[PDB]
Design a protein around this nucleic acid. Structure first.
Lengths: 71, 69, 85, 82, 75, 93, 75
RNA sequence: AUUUUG
């Protein structure tokens, strides 16, 4: 499964998550599940271009995810 | 369930803001509704006007609420 | 499917997607999930403000249409914009 | 009598479909399924603002795009009687 | 090992929740399920409007999971 | 069905349902099903003048999917038993 | 012509993805799954309202919003 | 992955 192989090859690395709203999250991908729910370590949140938040750990509900991109 | 409202006059508020007033005839497990003798009531502040509309089948996902009258 | 897509095989059809995008194209293939293959596709572009059509089109060639986002399918032959009946 | 049973019983008769974005489709119900997917014949498509109109010989409507359906009261009577 | 564990380990903790409609919650997580429905106790809500923020307080608040964007455990 | 049971325990108590369309309805919870559809009785609409069409409504049904929040007054027994139940599900399921 | 076979024939080549919103992606198709979530590499992302473009080395695109998949990439 | 967990 191509999506699963990509995810397994970026787990533990730093990724860009874009949500359908366009809000961005940069962080270390801990794990994901079948709904594309995500767990991120060391997370920076970006609205438009500005960093708005940081989280040591963040749960992202998978229905919001537009894409997961290697950094 | 909605069986308690069957054959009663109800107002149905839809997600797009419409107010339908009619007799609830039936429903199913999606809360799809079937209404008879329905009017659509158009509000501007506290004033309203009615439009006769007949029978509706309302898709459940668009139903915000159903109120007994 | 209640729609027998083979009746449109090699005819131009109009497709509308959830969100408002509209295209036309010549039906070359489909599956049971209503994914389509359309050829000579043209997209009717919309105004960013009103969401209404502008009259401008763009060509897109051979396109795979996702059945999950299809909301409307209609043959082009017999269609016409008309005045308020 | 369930909503979708009424819908199946409306096959062959006029129907009004309003989509979630306010477009309306007037025409004869050709077919329908349990998703509420519809096929209509002899269709008038009215755009949301009520501005532009179109005629379509037939069309397919995916069920999860529908806001509501309107049918003639006479249909409900004649279906109750049968 | 799975993302929902972050929520599991956050039980009885003050969590931060980001919700659709420009809403934010801060509150003690008392329960949740696989939809991310949850109940928060002693919860503050920040509603952002376009700039300006409205603050609200709830003794006990059920949140439907389909509005949830992000959950963050406490620091 | 954790929250279905929680809401069962709130039956005949007062709650306030905030809909995703921003309306808020206070009333007595009379019913809840597996989809978290709720029935309220003796309702009162917050900012009622803004929603004139609700003035003549006494009882109502609300589809679970349009609910944003249900909020109510706290009770310690409620809170600790709810947390206990969540932990019980997590040990079991 | 079966739609998904055409997509599979595009693996290794350029593919232009058009979302329901004013957003597009064009890049080399690495692969896809049963819901046509898509892995693209050496990708350009387009905001077709602002005209801003971004680059990505490799990404998994959620198939939920995809209206159109155009083999051969974008002109 | 076609209405109550997008």
């Amino acid at each position: 499964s191509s999506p699963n192989e990509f995810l397994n090859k970026v787990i533990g690395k730093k990724v860009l998550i874009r949500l359908s709203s366009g809000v961005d999250y940069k962080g270390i991908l801990s794990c994901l599940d079948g709904y594309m729910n995500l767990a991120l370590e060391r997370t920076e949140e970006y609205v438009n271009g500005k960093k708005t938040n940081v989280y040591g750990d963040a749960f992202i509900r998978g229905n919001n995810v537009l894409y997961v991109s290697a950094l | 369930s909605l069986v308690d409202y069957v054959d009663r006059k109800v107002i149905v508020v839809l997600r797009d803001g419409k107010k339908l007033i009619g007799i609830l005839r039936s429903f199913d497990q999606f809360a799809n509704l079937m209404l008879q003798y329905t009017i659509e009531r158009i509000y501007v502040d506290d004033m309203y006007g009615d439009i006769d509309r007949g029978v509706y089948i309302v898709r459940g996902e668009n139903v915000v609420l159903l109120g007994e009258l | 499917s209640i729609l027998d897509l083979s009746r449109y095989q090699d005819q131009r059809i109009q497709a509308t997607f959830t969100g408002g995008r509209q295209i036309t194209g010549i039906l070359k293939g489909f599956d049971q999930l209503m994914n389509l293959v359309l050829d000579d596709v043209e997209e009717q572009l919309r105004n960013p403000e009103d969401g209404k059509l502008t009259g401008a089109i763009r060509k897109l060639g051979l396109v795979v249409v996702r059945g999950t986002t299809l909301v409307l399918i209609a043959p082009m032959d017999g269609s016409e914009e008309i005045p308020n009946p | 009598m369930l909503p979708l049973t009424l819908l199946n019983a409306t096959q062959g008769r006029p129907i009004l479909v309003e989509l979630k974005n306010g477009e309306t489709f007037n025409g004869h119900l050709e077919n329908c399924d349990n998703y509420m997917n519809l096929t209509l014949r002899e269709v008038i498509r009215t755009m949301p603002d009520g501005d532009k109109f179109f005629r379509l010989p037939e069309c397919y409507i995916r069920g999860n795009n529908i806001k509501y359906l309107r049918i003639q009261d006479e249909v409900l009577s004649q279906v109750a009687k049968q | 090992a799975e993302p929902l564990d972050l929520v599991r380990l956050s039980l009885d903790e003050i969590v931060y929740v980001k919700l659709r409609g420009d809403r934010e919650l801060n509150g003690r997580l008392h329960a949740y399920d696989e939809h991310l429905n949850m109940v928060l106790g002693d919860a503050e809500e920040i509603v952002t409007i376009f700039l300006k923020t409205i603050r609200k307080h709830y003794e006990m608040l059920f949140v439907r999971g389909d509005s949830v964007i992000l959950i963050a455990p406490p620091r | 069905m954790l929250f279905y049971s929680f809401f069962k325990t709130l039956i005949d108590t007062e709650v306030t349902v905030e809909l995703k369309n921003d309306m808020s309805i206070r009333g007595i919870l009379k019913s809840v099903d597996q989809f978290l559809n709720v029935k309220l009785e003796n309702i009162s609409v917050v900012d009622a003048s803004k929603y004139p069409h609700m003035a003549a409504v006494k009882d109502l049904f609300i589809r679970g999917s349009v609910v944003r929040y249900v909020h109510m007054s706290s009770a310690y027994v409620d809170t600790i038993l709810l947390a206990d139940a969540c932990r019980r599900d997590l040990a079991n399921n | 012509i079966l739609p998904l076979e055409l997509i599979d024939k595009c693996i290794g080549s350029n593919l232009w993805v058009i979302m329901k919103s004013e957003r597009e992606f064009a890049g080399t198709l690495v692969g896809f799954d049963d819901y046509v979530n898509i892995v693209l590499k050496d990708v350009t992302e387009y905001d077709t309202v602002t005209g801003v473009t971004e680059k990505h080395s490799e990404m998994l695109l959620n198939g939920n919003g995809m209206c159109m998949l155009i083999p051969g990439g974008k002109p």
